[PDB]
Symmetry: D2
Subunit: 168 residues, 4 copies
Amino acid sequence: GSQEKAVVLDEQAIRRALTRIAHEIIERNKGVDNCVLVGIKTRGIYLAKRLAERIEQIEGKKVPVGELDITLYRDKGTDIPVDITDKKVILVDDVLYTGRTVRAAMDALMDLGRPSQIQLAVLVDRGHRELPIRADYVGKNVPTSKSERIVVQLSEVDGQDRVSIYEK
Amino acid sequence: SQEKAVVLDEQAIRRALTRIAHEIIERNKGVDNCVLVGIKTRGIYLAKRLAERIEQIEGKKVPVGELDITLYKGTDIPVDITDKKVILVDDVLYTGRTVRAAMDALMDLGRPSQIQLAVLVDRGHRELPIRADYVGKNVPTSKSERIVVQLSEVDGQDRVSIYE
Amino acid sequence: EKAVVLDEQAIRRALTRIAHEIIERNKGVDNCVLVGIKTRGIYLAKRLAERIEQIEGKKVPVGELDITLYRLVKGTDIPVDITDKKVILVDDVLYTGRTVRAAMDALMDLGRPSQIQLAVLVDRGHRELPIRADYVGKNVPTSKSERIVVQLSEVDGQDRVSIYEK
Amino acid sequence: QEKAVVLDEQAIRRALTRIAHEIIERNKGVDNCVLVGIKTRGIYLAKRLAERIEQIEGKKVPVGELDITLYRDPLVKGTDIPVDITDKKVILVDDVLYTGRTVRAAMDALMDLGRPSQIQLAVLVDRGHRELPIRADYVGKNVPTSKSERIVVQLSEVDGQDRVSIYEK
């Protein structure tokens, strides 16, 4: 839809969620040795870069960031600067809806290499999964109806940081 | 390896599977356009048990298919799965790599409208972002343990244990 | 009325599922007592006792608590001693958790149960206390300007759960 | 004796830092929040969290204390909360959540002192086996245990080291 129904994360809430996710990643992996962030185009890639910056500030370690170009089911090229074999790949996307985009991303990764794990971080989980896929790290669970959509704006691409529900 | 604990006896297995049958009916609002697909030997028997239980509850026969997948390939699914809700059934969810392969096989056969996952045991230690929709029992384990699932059809008794 | 979130078949499927969860988690229903929070919680409890009986061939005793719903304990009517029993408290909707907090305190005045479990048809979010249901029919997202209305046939003439802007 | 270490010192630090960020996130800052620790180790965890939150947000959250016999091993012995909690968000802090009986008693004590807007719960460890419908909002680690085990939390301020272990007993 075209009408903003609710703002569900403002700029500050986005920052607080990403910071908390960074801390989770570090906590669950016990540091970030052998981790690679891989963002899904376009907004996922910017979120991955933000997480890498935050992690570097927290831990003093640089996590490499790769990119996947995938058509988003919700609405097939690769650029990963390190070998992912035996690494822990943390996929990053803005919104988890059906899970079909993540399924395709997993398949791509598993063609490029044999990671030891693939984790998933998303800014929003909006429900309505169609595959048995779940994010390891979630910024905000945002309930939605099927007629609603999530709009993520990020300052790098869109001029402001905002997440909204839009409705017809 | 020695047995370290028993985590589900025969009655607990029966209770978990009956509850899972009721969850499947509940979440899908009936079982129209659903298809159960069992993974490997024990997932297939669990799928059959769930189909029999669902038939008794709802009076509808859900088709049961099979997938043969190597242990972390062949398929036998008796209906078209395009636009159907496929409920994959496995005995244990560990890394998620078997399920990832199973999803691949399914997508090769057809275009299901969704894929759900039912397991008797989730033992943690996922290596992919895969979760079961329906779980009999969450069984915490260390990496130096394994789950052993016995089902009467092939093993003589219904039991789940931790070994190692 | 904004959205019907459970119709009659969905209510039946949720309560049947909850009965099987209760039997599963308790490994049967020996030494269990259902206690409903008046009025709709009491009918839900009775439905659950009827389902459990069909499954297990045991009739779980059903008690009642009369409590002002935050969304004060006025009276209790529990037909068995609850000391060393597993009490399953039943309400229609979990919102803040303040009512359940008051119910727990009442129960603990009437006896020393081994445990207190909580079954609710709907969890609408917005907790204000660290209270969670063990058994939930449906998680129903709501805003603070909305309310959940539950109708059960025995006392309200139909089975329906809706969100109202109220 | 000791069966397994489940959080070492670095894992305790990382959990508490993460929890501080969760507290800030969920409450959108820490305005009108009050941390209340359960003795003996919950209070030190509350003070750690307050120090972390001050570093992150620049703001000092007041810390109170509750002295309660711990069911896991309830009587409310005493309270010492330095601000009024009416209409505030109280974040109760304990080291281990087991049956929930202690928290139940803590909630009662809080309600005797004031009318908080909400009561949140942070614990370092949730070891399962609840006997009441109580759950923590913030958890350091979910630690599966059997009924024949206990959790032992050591904190440097009380015990001379930071460690969480499972013991047979």
